[PDB]
Write a protein that binds this ligand. Sequence first.
Ligand SMILES: *[C@@H]1O[C@H](CO)[C@@H](O[C@@H]2O[C@H](CO)[C@@H](O[C@@H]3O[C@H](CO)[C@@H](O)[C@H](O)[C@@H]3O)[C@H](O)[C@H]2NC(C)=O)[C@H](O)[C@H]1NC(C)=O
Ligand SMILES: *[C@@H]1O[C@H](CO)[C@@H](O[C@@H]2O[C@H](CO)[C@@H](O[C@@H]3O[C@H](CO)[C@@H](O)[C@H](O)[C@@H]3O)[C@H](O)[C@H]2NC(C)=O)[C@H](O)[C@H]1NC(C)=O
Ligand code: NAG
Ligand code: NAG
Ligand code: NAG
Ligand code: NAG
Ligand code: NAG
Ligand code: NAG
Ligand code: NAG
Ligand code: NAG
Ligand code: CA
Ligand code: CA
Ligand code: CA
Ligand code: CA
Ligand code: CL
Ligand code: CL
Ligand code: CL
Ligand code: CL
Ligand code: CL
Ligand code: CL
Ligand code: CL
Ligand code: CL
Ligand code: CL
Ligand code: CL
Ligand code: CL
Ligand code: CL
Ligand code: CU
Ligand code: CU
Ligand code: MG
Ligand code: MG
Ligand code: MG
Ligand code: MG
Ligand code: MG
Ligand code: MG
Ligand code: XE
Ligand code: XE
Ligand code: XE
Ligand code: XE
Ligand code: XE
Ligand code: XE
Ligand code: XE
Ligand code: XE
Ligand code: XE
Ligand code: XE
Ligand code: XE
Ligand code: XE
Ligand code: XE
Ligand code: XE
Ligand code: XE
Ligand code: XE
Lengths: 735, 735
Amino acid sequence: AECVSNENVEIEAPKTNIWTSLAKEEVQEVLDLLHSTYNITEVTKADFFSNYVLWIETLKPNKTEALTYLDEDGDLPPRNARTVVYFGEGEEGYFEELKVGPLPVSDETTIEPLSFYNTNGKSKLPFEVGHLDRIKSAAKSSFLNKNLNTTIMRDVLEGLIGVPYEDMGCHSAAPQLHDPATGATVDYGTCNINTENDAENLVPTGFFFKFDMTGRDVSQWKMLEYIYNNKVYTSAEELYEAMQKDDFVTLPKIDVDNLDWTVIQRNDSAPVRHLDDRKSPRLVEPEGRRWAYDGDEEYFSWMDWGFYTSWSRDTGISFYDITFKGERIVYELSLQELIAEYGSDDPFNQHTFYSDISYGVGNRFSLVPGYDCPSTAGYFTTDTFEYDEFYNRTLSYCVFENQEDYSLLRHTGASYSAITQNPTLNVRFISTIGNYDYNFLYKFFLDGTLEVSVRAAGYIQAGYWNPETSAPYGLKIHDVLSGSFHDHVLNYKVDLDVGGTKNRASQYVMKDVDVEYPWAPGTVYNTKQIAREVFENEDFNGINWPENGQGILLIESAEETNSFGNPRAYNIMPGGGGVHRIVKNSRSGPETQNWARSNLFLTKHKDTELRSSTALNTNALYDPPVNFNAFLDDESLDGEDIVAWVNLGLHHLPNSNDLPNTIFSTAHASFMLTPFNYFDSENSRDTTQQVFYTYDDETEESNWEFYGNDWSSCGVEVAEPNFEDYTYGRGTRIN
Amino acid sequence: AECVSNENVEIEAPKTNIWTSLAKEEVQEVLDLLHSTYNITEVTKADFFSNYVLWIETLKPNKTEALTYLDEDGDLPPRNARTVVYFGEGEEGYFEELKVGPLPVSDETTIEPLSFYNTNGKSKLPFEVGHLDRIKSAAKSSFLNKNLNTTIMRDVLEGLIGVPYEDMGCHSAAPQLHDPATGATVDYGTCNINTENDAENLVPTGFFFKFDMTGRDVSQWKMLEYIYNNKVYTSAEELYEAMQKDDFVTLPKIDVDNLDWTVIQRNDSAPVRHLDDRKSPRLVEPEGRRWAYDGDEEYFSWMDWGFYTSWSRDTGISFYDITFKGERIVYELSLQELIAEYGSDDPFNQHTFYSDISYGVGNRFSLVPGYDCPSTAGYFTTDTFEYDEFYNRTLSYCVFENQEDYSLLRHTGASYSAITQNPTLNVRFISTIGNYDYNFLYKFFLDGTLEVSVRAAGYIQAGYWNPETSAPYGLKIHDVLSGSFHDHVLNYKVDLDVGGTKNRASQYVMKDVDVEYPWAPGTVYNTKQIAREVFENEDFNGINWPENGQGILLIESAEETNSFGNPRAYNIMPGGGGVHRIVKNSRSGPETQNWARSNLFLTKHKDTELRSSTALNTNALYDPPVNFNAFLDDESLDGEDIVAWVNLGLHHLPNSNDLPNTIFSTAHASFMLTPFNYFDSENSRDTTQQVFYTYDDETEESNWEFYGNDWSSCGVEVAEPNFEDYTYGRGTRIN
Ligand SMILES: *[C@@H]1O[C@H](CO)[C@@H](O[C@@H]2O[C@H](CO)[C@@H](O[C@@H]3O[C@H](CO)[C@@H](O)[C@H](O)[C@@H]3O)[C@H](O)[C@H]2NC(C)=O)[C@H](O)[C@H]1NC(C)=O
Ligand SMILES: *[C@@H]1O[C@H](CO)[C@@H](O[C@@H]2O[C@H](CO)[C@@H](O[C@@H]3O[C@H](CO)[C@@H](O)[C@H](O)[C@@H]3O)[C@H](O)[C@H]2NC(C)=O)[C@H](O)[C@H]1NC(C)=O
Ligand SMILES: *[C@@H]1O[C@H](CO)[C@@H](O)[C@H](O)[C@H]1NC(C)=O
Ligand SMILES: *[C@@H]1O[C@H](CO)[C@@H](O)[C@H](O)[C@H]1NC(C)=O
Ligand SMILES: *[C@@H]1O[C@H](CO)[C@@H](O)[C@H](O)[C@H]1NC(C)=O
Ligand SMILES: *[C@@H]1O[C@H](CO)[C@@H](O)[C@H](O)[C@H]1NC(C)=O
Ligand SMILES: *[C@@H]1O[C@H](CO)[C@@H](O)[C@H](O)[C@H]1NC(C)=O
Ligand SMILES: *[C@@H]1O[C@H](CO)[C@@H](O)[C@H](O)[C@H]1NC(C)=O
Ligand SMILES: *[C@@H]1O[C@H](CO)[C@@H](O)[C@H](O)[C@H]1NC(C)=O
Ligand SMILES: *[C@@H]1O[C@H](CO)[C@@H](O)[C@H](O)[C@H]1NC(C)=O
Ligand SMILES: [Ca+2]
Ligand SMILES: [Ca+2]
Ligand SMILES: [Ca+2]
Ligand SMILES: [Ca+2]
Ligand SMILES: [Cl-]
Ligand SMILES: [Cl-]
Ligand SMILES: [Cl-]
Ligand SMILES: [Cl-]
Ligand SMILES: [Cl-]
Ligand SMILES: [Cl-]
Ligand SMILES: [Cl-]
Ligand SMILES: [Cl-]
Ligand SMILES: [Cl-]
Ligand SMILES: [Cl-]
Ligand SMILES: [Cl-]
Ligand SMILES: [Cl-]
Ligand SMILES: [Cu+2]
Ligand SMILES: [Cu+2]
Ligand SMILES: [Mg+2]
Ligand SMILES: [Mg+2]
Ligand SMILES: [Mg+2]
Ligand SMILES: [Mg+2]
Ligand SMILES: [Mg+2]
Ligand SMILES: [Mg+2]
Ligand SMILES: [Xe]
Ligand SMILES: [Xe]
Ligand SMILES: [Xe]
Ligand SMILES: [Xe]
Ligand SMILES: [Xe]
Ligand SMILES: [Xe]
Ligand SMILES: [Xe]
Ligand SMILES: [Xe]
Ligand SMILES: [Xe]
Ligand SMILES: [Xe]
Ligand SMILES: [Xe]
Ligand SMILES: [Xe]
Ligand SMILES: [Xe]
Ligand SMILES: [Xe]
Ligand SMILES: [Xe]
Ligand SMILES: [Xe]
């Protein structure tokens, strides 16, 4: 007999998604208004002296107006755009952030400087510390080719590396290094061997260079240094001549004829493991899908949870208005920034401190059905706007119900067994940013717990192994390859509003203590106690997870209690990857990523403290648009709207198990938000996905209660994934 | 079209399972020899002055003889039994451990004192610190009834608690408290309200008592104290008379008429959540099972892994000869002990320091098919012997292939996407020990990684909430109920033999450092470095996981390297629950659990250091059979057979989310064993469970390579679990 089929369920969201990305039509109206207001050049025709548009996206509503709309029948918040435009028509070039609205475009619409969420109080980012945009990238690539493809340098490179200039690629370290004291902007660079399989990061040559790129006039840019085997040369001629001498040491060259060790996919001449000719297990939905959605509003419901999603170019997916059993628990949950900070003996990796939101986390590729997500997943389309084009991205994120490999709870005793299954709602997106693949998962449980996790995979940014200097910074993982040591750190804005906005943050500290008890006078016991301590003010040092896990961190309602007098609370519980940066004082990130130095921070919510980083931060080393430390000014948190900024990380020291790629299983970080006296009891008990087995002692009869779930054998069709929907590329573009 | 069916595959183990439990026939021969050698009384007729048999099990082979058999065509090790017999026929009673073999019983068979694995050098455990066996339990229960069911005490109890003696149960704290200085043995106790649903732990009355139980003559045992509202009474009469006075404070009584808050299973009058009338997702095997086994030898193979299992009464499942790609990586992996140590204002919980192996972890209940394990699982039968009966336990552990909710790795770039699925082999057993349910999972991955995890659920051991004294030890979670604060700590013996037995233990320490580089003279950089440090000797302090995760712990081959010169290694990587005891100096566990004070210990392998605890430890407070600290005697680990003793734990402070039961999702601990330069590369690349997608730039054609896996739609029957195989109880017994 066939399993009972059910159709996918669609619902109407309670409210409008006021956080959603701009519609194509809204972007068009904004772009038109900009073109009519300013002299805007198309990006394909633009240079450092043109004006052109970079970005146009939603300027999300402020919280109080949002909550008045959601909870108190207020007006829709004004619909506005944030745009970033490069202005090069003046004596000095700069990027400027501008607000355009309200939308749709009407007689009330204005264009104004936008700076309220920048701690530095500026709408304008100077050229010298500007975004590494398509224009600046093209100029740098042209400048490098001009210098490295001369007759002499062609010879220097081939002689040192072993392949001609055509067979390598030269490129610059990020961030650039602007010195506000001198006005100079310099950058380092290296070369990697070209590959057919995107494995250039595994073949670094150990040839380095340094250049000055100060000012908008590229005719004045100059190569400063060539660096090779830890020696500095101040001209091509000096290096060429050094190489002709008999005392010159040339480091071992990459074996470019044998690069099969860089290849990810299966070698079809490899033997197959026993039984690997049988397909691996599959998750199926015997009675159809158990989550619902509003397609227009990107609102989701599952087992008494509800939330809206939003998408941005900088960060990818965000969540708003997360409710459980009819009560908002989180106003905003949003990934803010991802960094990768390397330590090295060499001037390329030692100067690498990536800000992934500068590149964009939300402007990448589709998910591969069946593999990136289970075949039971639903897929959603999002969009972004960059450089004159609207990008529609299908299969951008997925939603699926998992069956976890362990039950949610159980007990056996007194002639019964009671077990509850553990289905979870899962939202995933994957962001492949060059070499790295980041896999983001949000997992919701039946009791009101949410787990936020990240895993990493892809190609490592390796380094040339120099036996004299490389050992303190990495392991030798191939003939001339070091697995360069680096930190990954990610920041999440977790705007918990537990039993309303007015909250307190507390910790239950656990300690061993010597006590005497009234029932055994004179006898000292070494025992353990808890002590509740309130986080009364913003702490500049942040909060690091306690030694030996001897504490619990809570966000409590300031006024609401459960039936036993306990403040309603949620526990922020670290899972794996509760680490922060090792390095304290980076020349490549002095003030640009100051949230990354502790496990977590608690601040008073402000609309002006929207975000802990920006896409414009990375090259603004000393005066970034957002300096996170500006948020930390000793404000009372004692009965206030608190935001937690929670970090996840990994200290990655690649070894053989990272070649050809890093694996997701061991590169993992997570935290949980779990109810703590939030209810009077554990709130999964109403699920039907449980069994109650009883045995009668006298009659020797067993009884099985399955609460309406029929476990009888039935037939299902195991459906083919929507593979046809997957095409390579970073979105379908429309100029 | 129907999915291609395949039958379950059975294989022949490479060798005999020399670690397997005794056959019924072996146990019978041993029991017969004991009965012919000594005057043995049946346990149902026995007292403190009889002799009777407690336990008969396999005395596992010593390592060198085992390895000679497995690897060098040696003889089968001798087949021996360990038995424990209580001898009460002498002037003083004691338990004695005895070796019986070789088996089968022949003219060569002897019975000898067995003590080699006891650090205290004794085969005999004195009565005073004896096992809490069926005989001693019965005597204590009889003694308590004699004292608490008198006319006066019946009145005292009803008056204080609110229900008659028939409606409560009184019982003693574990461990007992023997004082070797005085020879006295005392114990504390309390009463809980009787329930129909095994929820007595949620209804503690706050009535306590203390008794002296010194010696085998129960006529000399005496009640010492009654303790109530933090006052001590030295007779029933004193307390009765105190209660008649007008100044007497009676603490608030349990509302025994309203205990629905203790009930686990669904209330069928509760509303159903949206779409919870659809069955939750199911894992299926479209082309059948992909692991194989030898049923007689309990040998398992899956995707180039192999191992044997063994079962014991004390600990449940153990693993031996774990190999991956034809090489042993772990000789022995075995759970050793589980403790639960409470802190409290009251004399019951403050004296509770459970040793779960004393009760037995491997003598519990069957798994519930479909709920405890996926319906695709295979189930295995094990056995134990206790008190004259052989117990056959069906559905004792399960083996299943999961599909993890994330892929093992991926990369997108250069017009391809390459993704590998993440199937894992999973071995589970669940041990419900009274109130607690422990869920043990061993998860094997395609690359050679193994994850060991535990989750906990069940009823908490709560405490009576006294507003004057309870607050430092727990939260008030119901009207008169405290969620008593406790540590769970579990010890695993992890006998890694990485590239042979001769190994080294090392750590890569991570630190920030200020350096100057040859390519930028005079410029100080704050960067980060690694430093390899060898653990040259056994450290009495053990090893605690590093602050901010700034280190990697390795077990390395002493001589074998990979192709790049790195020692072949495995990384012991902490996951969640990397915590140890808070309390340092317990009166209830002075010397009995000394492994629990750090995250992990490294020792030189010895057959005499078989196990870090014993079932006989818990009441032997100062001179236990095994004092783990005896293992730690500063021996060189520099090119030696190393064993790692790895702890997992939880500091549990129950809140509302633990009523009516604790949930498995948030009560979790794990560690991973992962290859680290063990191969030249990451070793999952040969799996067929992957996709290679390519896109041609010119022809606009996509190609999908699925390596023999057909994702076409097909029909399967979703099978009913083997529910008929599940019967309540702790094994089918045979006298
Ligand atoms: C959301 O909240 C933020 C923070 O409260 C609001 O920021 C404010 O934006 C206005 C413009 O709409 C800024 O006013 C301007 O100030 C400059 C500086 O003197 C002045 O030259 C202009 O004439 C104008 O008055 C204001 O400074 C800024 N406030 C802060 C604290 O930075 C924002 O308006 C809110 N958005 C919405 C949709 O209501
Ligand atoms: C596995 O290895 C252990 C540890 O090496 C062996 O333990 C040894 O067991 C023997 C008995 O078989 C003990 O010998 C006895 O010693 C006592 C004490 O003086 C003596 O009275 C007896 O006459 C007898 O000689 C021996 O002490 C003990 N060794 C240690 C270090 O404690 C065990 O025999 C091995 N098992 C197998 C199956 O080979
Ligand atoms: C717009 O800018 C370009 C330079 O990019 C300039 O040549 C042109 O004259 C400007 N248009 C107007 C109307 O001033
Ligand atoms: C580099 O120089 C060679 C000739 O010296 C030329 O053929 C080639 O096109 C140049 N490459 C680029 C990208 O300019
Ligand atoms: C495939 O396997 C063969 C045989 O081991 C090996 O020589 C070759 O390097 C492999 N090819 C690739 C591209 O991985
Ligand atoms: C984006 O793609 C979706 C799905 O194909 C489609 O509904 C929508 O019209 C697209 N948007 C635009 C403006 O191309
Ligand atoms: C065996 O022990 C019992 C006491 O438990 C005793 O009465 C009996 O006589 C003993 N048997 C022999 C043969 O001595
Ligand atoms: C307790 O005492 C009462 C009479 O006082 C009696 O009826 C009952 O059987 C006793 N219970 C036990 C278990 O001895
Ligand atoms: C079932 O639900 C009803 C209505 O809320 C409640 O009164 C009762 O306590 C519940 N019964 C049990 C046994 O949980
Ligand atoms: C234990 O149970 C298994 C499975 O039912 C059976 O094969 C075996 O004979 C049983 N052992 C004994 C001795 O009862
Ligand atoms: Ca908040
Ligand atoms: Ca502040
Ligand atoms: Ca070993
Ligand atoms: Ca030792
Ligand atoms: Cl400005
Ligand atoms: Cl110019
Ligand atoms: Cl090479
Ligand atoms: Cl879909
Ligand atoms: Cl407190
Ligand atoms: Cl700056
Ligand atoms: Cl002895
Ligand atoms: Cl007696
Ligand atoms: Cl009550
Ligand atoms: Cl089975
Ligand atoms: Cl080192
Ligand atoms: Cl003792
Ligand atoms: Cu990394
Ligand atoms: Cu617990
Ligand atoms: Mg609508
Ligand atoms: Mg839209
Ligand atoms: Mg109006
Ligand atoms: Mg056989
Ligand atoms: Mg057997
Ligand atoms: Mg022989
Ligand atoms: Xe657009
Ligand atoms: Xe140069
Ligand atoms: Xe997946
Ligand atoms: Xe949440
Ligand atoms: Xe990460
Ligand atoms: Xe904490
Ligand atoms: Xe991370
Ligand atoms: Xe990560
Ligand atoms: Xe037996
Ligand atoms: Xe007493
Ligand atoms: Xe499960
Ligand atoms: Xe392993
Ligand atoms: Xe646990
Ligand atoms: Xe470590
Ligand atoms: Xe644990
Ligand atoms: Xe646990």
